[PDB]
Design a protein around this nucleic acid. Structure first.
Lengths: 341, 134, 52, 421, 116, 73, 225, 36
RNA sequence: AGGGAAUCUGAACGAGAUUCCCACUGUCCCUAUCUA
RNA sequence: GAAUGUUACCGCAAUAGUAAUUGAACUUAGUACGAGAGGAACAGUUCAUUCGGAUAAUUGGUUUUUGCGGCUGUCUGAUCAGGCAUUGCCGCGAAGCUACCAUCCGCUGGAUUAUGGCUGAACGCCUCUAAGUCAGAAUCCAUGCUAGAACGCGGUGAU
């Protein structure tokens, strides 16, 4: 096999942490560098191909895309790291004073038995003109060469029966560390949307813990699957919206439909919020939390520069076989049934 | 040699030791594959052809004029489910191929039955001797 | 065939990266950061919904 | 084989040839054996080396023998042409020495392997192997002269012109430095010097031209006064199915008497008697009619400074060598000008469009803006093509509003009847 | 893009679903699922099997001859794209769908009479 | 690929194997006689056109039918 | 008027283009030099259409047409059919034809007055060529070569057949077409003469491997200069 | 670059003592060759 | 009411042997899944 | 997996491994170069082969969901229900698992080797080297990619 992907062992957690970040330019505006959601879905798209030099210039191509569900990420903190001869070293983290039920749930393994007394003295530590919070924020701005944002996911807006959101750390590639820590100050308790991180025609690297297959039998026997994998260069085809109906509508199809198939995806619900439709196949299975970083570097070929003109979204039944896009088209083709009249 | 433009991957249905029919009016009725020109190399894997690939093939049932000499053969019918870029998966009724010189010029004057879309695109003179495409 | 780490191809790709190939990414980034700045104002309106 | 021979594997100068074959047997074969091994592995070791060096020299020798053209088996022109440029006996002596040496090396290898299956020590076996390859070295050291000759012949035959003895040819002759160099200079694209001395040209220069849709080749010659350079010309006259264009300088130039050209023409007369001669002039005038006494001759007066009569000589030469309901055209095409490539003022093609827009494989051609519509505001076409399980193009016709209203009449004819209760 | 008919069902075949089969005669047999494809491979009569539409047309459980059904023609002579002549179709298709649904409902009532 | 009339098939198992299309032609008075039967309706019309889609049960639908046509002759 | 060009280094012009009296149809290759090859010689007089059939570059040996009409096969998408109508003038009609055979450039060899066809073509198209193109239709063979398009170049001025055509077949066939016919070649002895060159009443475009002795024959029989 | 294998400077005891036997052998030859 | 045809061996043979022709198969290309 | 107050979350990265591979297709071209026969290369773009990491949208495969249906036998005195058949047999077949028999993805900076050089001694010329110095391989080291020291460390929540 590949000797790089060793030791071929089970990961530390389902939420794999992002190993490296995109560099930094100290003149660029403040913007997030990685996003997270919940991968669950896969679907077929057709599009006309404006890729000149190819055998399919001004032709139409069918291809497989994946739908990661991405509820609006909520900022609950910021971390500052000093540059040492020993690597980086977190000197101060700061939180949001009033955090959701989801994250106070993340701080316990057994949620129901506890008195739910998580950040009581920390919120009481805030309870004045600031004084100590602004002291720690001065501490971050004075030192700390890089600044990373503590976020979490909106787990309840996702159909998952987990209730327990994931903490993460996302660096900022907007220059002047002052603007980093003050962007964070403008964003405590607030939420960050998907399309404020990504857009169409943008290459990303989705990282995921790879679908556990359990025990398996130099070509050696042992563990197969459940490894933390980084896959790079998956083009974003569509960023979606929850409130907006006709997400499944293209420039061509234009029928008022959601990208959610009939009876939803298999083993996972519908979509009730923002999503990213990424091309190809992201690692992990359905219901799996994926962390989407962006490219690391200027990765422009013509596979990264071209504009996607989506023509049609397959929303037919994945559970079973596909014959109808809408429920409306099932009973339009069928005629009327027994229990109808 | 002969192939026009780039060549993209379609599924492989015709390995070495496969008898396909002959489609041109040259004289041969069938064709026995012996080698595939421009194939990959694994351990223990047989050379497998597909639609629109020049193979080296011998006549088994046909005119003695077309025999005595192993000659290039371009496969025009596959019968194994390959994929088109326009959504559909398709396959034909039988395996068929047409005989030509190394340059890609046809010996026969007409090709019977359907000729594959990919094969007619890659080989120009096959599409010149084509009655039916797709 | 030239390798992935073939020096001449890395230099030819650096000739690319100082042209159109970065400029499109540096326009996309501005459109992403713009909508991020747009995401503050909506939430601030929903601050003023409760403040009303 | 055919006309020319550039494709010959190079000839190593017998010292380097040894340094190629012997070093390759040191690098490609295993080289390390203990004395403490079995005798069978010691035997097989040195056998493998004697044999491999055997195949080494033989491979290099076979490349020389098969590479060089079999002089007396090619073609009568080439058999004699190589005989003029090179001492034909020595050319066959050299290749005979290689054919001898290859059989020698084969004999040596076959000897010492047979002698090697009886070795009792590593020392004895080593002495026998050293004996074998050293003997081969001695054979190749005896080849320092013929291979030095074979490299020079390889280089000079690799640069020789390719005349075709079956295409329509025309020899260009006359005294050295008459002005025939200016003729081939002004008939075709071939750079031949018109330097003011006797033997400027040293070999047969070739010029191709096309007239009456046919491939012609005019062969320039050094000239006849005997030398290897001089006899090259004469045998080119003799063996080529051709017409000979003997050139004369009726002027103070050339530095030779015109009477000597008369003497030479009538002396060389026998071997060009079968070739239908043309003579071109570039008591006294009467001795031009003495040249006219030849059965097959024609006389023409020309000047190389003007470009018409030089062409007319060609015309007569080629002529000698051959004997030896209404259509629909739109007026938008008829009124249209021609495409001049070096014109500053013309329409820009798509070729120039893609250059101005940058690159070949990077520009995407807009299929739009090139098709005809009623309103060019809707030029950027979207066209839905599919709505709810049923494709648009199948539903798409003109007068669908009137056809819909016909179905609207068919609504009200079933509305009041009472089918919907 | 084309939404086709299944050779067995006459159900809508979307791009990237089922298999097209081509004979040595060379005609297209598009299918919506391997249920229909294996049903064709078994060399069955569709009009005998009840779950197809070919059965429902000839047996008359659904309607065959109607003015709404004559507009789903395989149309050949092409149009030069008028913004108005497409805007009219968008509302025409949504109109003819409503009328066809109401007519089919009326056909089901006229068939299911005499059961009450 | 072979095409014949149905009437050519009547006058002759061995026919059906090599064939692909039998053809319905109304201009003949012979077919007008064959049209007026309890046969040539209910699935029989489509069975004529697609001969290699049939199977055993639909072959016997034709082999019984031929003998009905032969008795009219 | 005899132009000598290539498409992506290819001598077979008729495969990758269809050229008539009122229009020129070209494939969308990466290189625009083939489009500019006609735009140099024809200009803005007759429309040159950037087009595809079924997403194939091989247009000229897939389509049929003259000054009056244009025929495309079944495989032509409604987007390509929309595109051809938009690009073309209203004097020229367009109709998609459903058949056993799809390579129309090999089946319908025609000019503005006459047409030769494959002997095994259906009756429906035989009465459709007569209507849309308005030309006389003949189920005629060229020396046992069943495909009439690739082995016969044709115009209103004259025609060109493959060199294996008999003298009896020349006299018999030219009696049908009423134009002078010469058995000749294209692209240094290529037998495919229909796809080796495109032609109309005022232009003949060959491939860059067509030798001048053949080019003089082309210029003669089509009567350019 | 791929740095190739380095020769040892550890002389094994078999080598070292064999060196002494080979040396003393060279002596016995040199004393005999001195007489001629 | 599994073939067939030759040959070597003691004209068919005998589960004799070999070779070829035709058919068949996961033996393989290349494994995949299920049950005990 | 005990231990270093407990307990939880977020981390850092010493160290160890590491991976991509080769083929041709279009312009560049029928230009350079060429008597001709022929006939390139960089920059731009497009595929494929082998190898690896994945993934199941579709296709094919697969079925003790033995899911539904059909056939043979067998018992309740007959219908229906099934008891039953060493899973009796046959067709289809979800979920799951799966196949170059399916699909996706697989990088960019410094230091160098041979070599080509600059300034320039030794040696009142010279000299790519001696002191210096620029370029330069699929090479090396990093970036990236994988594990995290259970006796390496850090920051943060909880009395």
């Amino acid at each position: 096999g590949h000797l790089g992907f060793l030791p071929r062992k089970r990961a530390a957690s389902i939420r794999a942490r992002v190993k490296a970040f995109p560099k930094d330019d100290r003149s660029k505006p403040v913007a997030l560098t990685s996003f997270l959601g919940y991968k669950a879905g896969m679907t077929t798209i057709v599009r006309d191909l404006d890729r000149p030099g190819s055998k399919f210039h001004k032709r139409e191509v069918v291809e497989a895309v994946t739908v990661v569900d991405t509820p609006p990420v909520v900022v609950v903190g910021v971390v500052g790291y000093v540059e040492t001869p020993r690597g980086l070293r977190s000197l101060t983290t700061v939180w949001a004073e009033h955090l959701s039920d989801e994250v106070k749930r993340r701080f316990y393994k057994n949620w129901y038995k506890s008195k739910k007394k998580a950040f009581t003295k920390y919120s009481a530590k805030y309870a004045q003109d600031g004084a100590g919070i602004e002291r720690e924020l001065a501490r971050i701005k004075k030192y700390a060469s890089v600044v990373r944002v503590l976020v979490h996911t909106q787990i309840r807006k996702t159909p998952l029966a987990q209730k327990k959101a994931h903490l993460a750390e996302i660096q900022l590639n907007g220059g002047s560390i002052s603007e980093k820590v003050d962007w964070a100050r403008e964003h405590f308790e607030k939420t960050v949307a998907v399309d404020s991180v990504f857009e169409q025609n943008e290459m990303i690297d989705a990282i995921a813990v790879t679908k556990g297959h359990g025990f398996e039998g130099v070509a050696r026997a042992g563990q197969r699957g459940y490894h933390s994998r980084t896959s790079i260069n998956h083009k974003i085809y569509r960023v979606g919206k929850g409130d907006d109906e006709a997400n499944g509508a293209t420039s061509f199809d234009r029928t008022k439909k959601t990208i959610t198939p009939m009876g939803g995806f298999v083993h996972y619900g519908e979509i009730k919020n923002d999503f990213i439709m990424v091309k190809g196949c992201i690692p992990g299975n359905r219901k799996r939390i994926v962390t989407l970083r962006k490219s690391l570097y200027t990765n422009t070929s013509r596979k990264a520069l071209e504009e996607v003109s989506l023509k049609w979204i397959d929303t037919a039944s994945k559970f079973g076989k596909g014959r109808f896009q809408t429920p409306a088209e099932k009973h339009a083709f069928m005629g009327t049934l027994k229990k109808d009249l | 040699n002969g192939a026009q433009g780039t060549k993209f991957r379609i599924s492989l249905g015709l390995p070495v030791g496969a008898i396909m029919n002959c489609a041109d009016n040259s004289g041969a009725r069938n064709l026995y594959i012996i080698a595939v020109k421009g194939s990959g190399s694994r351990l223990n894997r047989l050379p497998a052809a597909s639609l629109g690939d020049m193979v080296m093939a011998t006549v088994k049932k046909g005119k003695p004029e077309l025999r005595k000499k192993v000659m290039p053969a371009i496969v025009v019918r596959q019968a194994k489910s390959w994929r088109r870029r326009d959504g559909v998966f398709l396959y034909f009724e039988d395996n068929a191929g047409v005989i030509a010189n190394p340059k890609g010029e046809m010996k026969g004057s007409a090709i019977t039955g359907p000729v594959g879309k990919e094969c007619a695109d890659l080989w120009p003179r096959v599409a010149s001797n084509s009655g039916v495409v797709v | 065939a030239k390798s992935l780490r073939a020096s001449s191809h890395l230099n030819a790709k650096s000739v690319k990266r100082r042209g159109v190939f970065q400029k499109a990414v540096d326009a996309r980034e501005q459109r992403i950061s713009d909508k991020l700045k747009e995401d503050l104002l909506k939430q601030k309106l929903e601050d003023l919904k409760k403040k009303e | 084989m055919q006309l020319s021979w550039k494709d010959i594997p190079t000839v190593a100068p017998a010292n380097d040839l040894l340094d190629i074959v012997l070093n390759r047997t040191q690098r490609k074969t295993p080289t390390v054996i203990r004395p403490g091994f079995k005798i069978t592995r010691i035997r097989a070791f040195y056998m493998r080396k004697v044999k491999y060096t055997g195949e080494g020299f033989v491979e290099k020798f076979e490349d020389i023998l098969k590479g060089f053209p079999n002089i007396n088996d090619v073609h009568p022109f080439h058999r004699d042409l190589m005989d003029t440029l090179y001492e034909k006996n020595h050319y066959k002596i050299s290749l005979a020495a290689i054919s001898r040496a290859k059989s020698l090396v084969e004999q040596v290898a076959r000897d010492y392997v047979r002698l090697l299956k009886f070795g009792q020590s590593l020392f004895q076996c080593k002495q026998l192997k050293r004996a074998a390859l050293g003997r081969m070295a001695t054979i190749v050291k005896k080849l320092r002269d013929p291979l030095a000759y074979l490299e020079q012949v390889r280089q000079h035959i690799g640069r020789l012109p390719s005349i075709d003895p079956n295409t329509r040819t025309l020899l260009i002759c006359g005294y050295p430095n008459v002005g025939k160099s200016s003729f081939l200079r002004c008939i075709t694209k071939s750079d031949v010097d018109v330097q003011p001395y006797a033997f400027t040209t040293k070999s047969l220069y070739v010029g191709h031209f096309d007239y009456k849709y046919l491939r012609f080749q005019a062969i320039d010659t050094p000239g006849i006064l005997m030398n290897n350079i001089e006899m090259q010309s004469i045998y080119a006259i003799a063996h080529l199915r051709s017409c000979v264009l003997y050139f004369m300088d009726l002027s103070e130039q050339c530095g030779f008497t015109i009477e000597a050209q008369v003497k030479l023409f009538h002396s060389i007369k026998p071997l060009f008697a079968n070739k239908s001669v043309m003579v071109v002039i570039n008591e006294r005038a009467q001795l031009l009619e003495s040249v006219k006494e030849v059965p097959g001759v024609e006389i023409m007066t020309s000047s190389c400074q003007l470009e018409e009569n030089v062409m007319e000589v060609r015309n007569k030469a080629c002529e000698k060598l051959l004997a030896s309901r209404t259509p629909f055209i739109p007026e938008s095409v008829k009124n249209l000008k021609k495409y001049d490539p070096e014109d500053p003022n013309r329409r820009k093609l798509a070729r120039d469009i893609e250059a101005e827009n940058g690159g070949a494989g990077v520009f995407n051609v807009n299929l739009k803006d090139k098709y005809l519509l009623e309103d060019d505001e809707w030029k950027n076409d979207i066209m839905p093509e599919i709505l709810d399980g049923k494709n648009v193009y199948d539903f798409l016709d003109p007068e669908i509003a009137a056809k819909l209203q016909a179905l609207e009449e068919e609504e009200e004819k079933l509305e009041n009847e009472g089918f919907y209760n | 893009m084309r939404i086709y008919q299944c050779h067995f069902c006459s159900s809508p075949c979307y791009p990237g679903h089922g298999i097209m089969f081509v004979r040595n005669d060379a005609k297209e047999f598009r299918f919506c699922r391997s249920k229909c494809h294996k049903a064709f491979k078994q060399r069955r009569n569709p009009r005998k099997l009840k779950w197809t539409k070919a059965f429902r047309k000839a047996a008359g459980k659904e309607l065959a001859v109607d003015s709404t059904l004559t507009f789903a023609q395989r149309r050949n002579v092409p149009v030069r794209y008028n913004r108005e002549l497409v805007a009219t179709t968008l509302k025409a298709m949504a109109r003819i769908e409503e009328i066809r649904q109401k007519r089919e409902r009326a056909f089901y009532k006229n068939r299911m009479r005499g059961n009450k | 690929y072979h095409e014949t009339s149905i009437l050519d098939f009547v006058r002759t198992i061995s026919m059906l194997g090599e064939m692909n299309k039998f053809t319905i032609d109304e201009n003949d008075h012979e077919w007008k006689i064959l049209k007026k039967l309890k046969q040539t309706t209910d699935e029989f019309r489509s069975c004529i056109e697609d001969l290699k889609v049939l199977g055993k049960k639909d072959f016997k639908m034709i082999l019984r039918w031929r003998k009905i046509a032969r008795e009219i002759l | 008027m005899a132009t000598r060009t290539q498409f992506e280094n290819s001598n077979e012009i008729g495969v990758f283009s269809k050229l008539t009296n009122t229009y020129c149809l070209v494939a969308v290759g990466g290189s625009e030099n083939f489009y500019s090859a006609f735009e140099a010689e024809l200009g803005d007089a007759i429309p040159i259409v950037h087009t595809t059939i079924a997403g194939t570059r091989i247009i000229g040996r897939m389509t049929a047409g003259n000054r009056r009409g244009l025929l495309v096969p079944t495989q032509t998408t409604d987007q390509e059919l929309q595109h051809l109508r938009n690009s073309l003038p209203d004097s020229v009609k367009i109709q998609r034809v459903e058949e056993r055979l799809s390579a129309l450039g090999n089946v319908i060899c025609c000019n503005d007055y006459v047409a030769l066809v494959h002997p095994d073509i259906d009756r429906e198209t035989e009465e459709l060529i007569s209507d849309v193109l308005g030309v006389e239709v003949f189920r005629q063979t060229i020396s046992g070569n069943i495909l009439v398009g690739s082995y016969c170049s044709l115009s209103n001025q004259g025609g060109l057949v493959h060199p294996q055509t008999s003298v009896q077949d020349q006299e018999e066939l030219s009696s049908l077409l009423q134009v002078p016919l010469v058995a000749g070649t294209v692209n240094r002895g290529s037998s495919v003469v229909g796809a080796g060159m495109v032609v109309n009443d005022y232009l003949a475009v060959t491939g860059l491997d067509t030798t001048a002795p053949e080019l003089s024959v082309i210029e003669s029989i089509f009567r350019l200069q | 670059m791929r740095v190739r294998k380095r020769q040892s400077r550890r002389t094994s005891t078999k080598l070292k003592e064999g060196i002494k036997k080979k040396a003393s052998a060279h002596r016995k030859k040199e004393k005999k060759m001195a007489k001629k």
